[PDB]
Scaffold this active site. Structure first.
Site, PDB file in Angstrom:
ATOM      1  N   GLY A  22       0.749  -1.239   0.000  1.00  0.00           N
ATOM      2  CA  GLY A  22       0.000   0.000   0.000  1.00  0.00           C
ATOM      3  C   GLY A  22       0.785   1.300   0.000  1.00  0.00           C
ATOM      4  N   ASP A 129       8.783 -11.710   5.519  1.00  0.00           N
ATOM      5  CA  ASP A 129       9.515 -10.699   4.783  1.00  0.00           C
ATOM      6  C   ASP A 129      10.196  -9.768   5.787  1.00  0.00           C
ATOM      7  OD1 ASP A 129       8.884  -7.961   2.598  1.00  0.00           O
ATOM      8  OD2 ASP A 129      10.078  -9.581   1.999  1.00  0.00           O
TER       9      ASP A 129
END
Ligand code: 324
Length: 258
Positions: A22, A129
């Site tokens: 985002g 991640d």
């Protein structure tokens, strides 16, 4: 119980940055916050479940080194709300500031990072991640780990690069991730720095033939911290240490002291 912020309450100002996820703004809501507005216009009713299933995972994180989830919007845009952080991330510090951090201060940052990670796992959350770019240093003291729930191959275990079978993303993959952060911390440097080629690295690390160069660690890293590293960076995944014992060694070597 339900954590939705009704339309209006967030005063979105200033665009900080983004991602495949985002776009992240600063904002006013009962003090400062951060608002990551997803890349989505019209919320398809099955998309209001994608989100609220991802949110139910976020709201199972309470801890001082896990970024503070605080609320989610719905009505101007899908969005996640959290504490606003101050200063800049581990990456910015370890690379494009040139801030001398003392051995003391570097170990602590490693301590506080694996504090985040052990908690998440105790909660059965694979991060997926972890990297220095998604470890924000609030006030230049407190680690806050975020952006959980191609991209960056440098922190990617060989099995992820290539792909196991039924996994491969797992508590262990998170652990090699944590080693690469250790290399950065304990060498002040991104690895493969001299070999600057994504394909080369994807092909060569997954095939088991390139692994970080540990001679570039600053001559004053402890040898406990150096051996801890190379355990985590193990190419065989299940020879890797899981997180309870990772959090043992680090705090338990941290003494010494100054
Ligand atoms: C609790 C986990 C939420 S997350 O996994 O979606 N991570 C997340 C969610 C929303 C966000 F806005 C951010 C984010 O990037 C920041 C959170 N606080 C911040 N403070 C300063 C800066 Cl520059 C960026 C951020 C972020 F890292």
């Amino acid at each position: 119980d339900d954590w939705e912020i009704p339309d209006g309450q967030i005063t979105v100002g200033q665009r900080i940055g983004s991602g495949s996820f985002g776009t992240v703004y600063k904002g006013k809501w009962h003090g400062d916050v951060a608002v990551k507005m997803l890349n989505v216009t019209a919320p398809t009713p099955q998309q209001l479940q994608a989100f609220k299933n991802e949110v139910g995972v976020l709201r199972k994180t309470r801890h001082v080194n896990i970024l503070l989830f605080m609320g989610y919007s719905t009505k101007p845009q899908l969005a996640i709300v959290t504490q606003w952080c101050e200063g800049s991330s581990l990456y910015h510090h370890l690379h494009a500031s040139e801030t001398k951090f003392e051995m003391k201060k570097l170990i602590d940052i490693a301590r506080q990072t694996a504090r985040g990670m052990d908690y998440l796992h105790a909660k059965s959350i694979i991060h997926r991640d972890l990297k220095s770019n998604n470890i924000f240093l609030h006030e230049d003291n407190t680690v806050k780990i975020g952006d959980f729930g191609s991209g960056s191959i440098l922190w990617m275990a060989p099995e992820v690069i290539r792909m196991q079978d039924s996994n491969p993303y797992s508590f262990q993959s998170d652990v090699y991730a944590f080693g690469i952060v250790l290399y950065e911390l304990m060498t002040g440097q991104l690895p493969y720095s001299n070999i600057n080629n994504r394909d080369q690295i994807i092909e060569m690390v997954g095939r088991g033939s390139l692994s970080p160069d540990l001679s570039k660690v600053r001559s004053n890293c402890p040898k406990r911290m150096k051996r801890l590293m190379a355990e985590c960076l193990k190419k065989k995944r299940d020879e890797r240490p899981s997180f309870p014992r990772i959090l043992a060694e680090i705090e338990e070597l941290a003494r010494e002291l100054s």
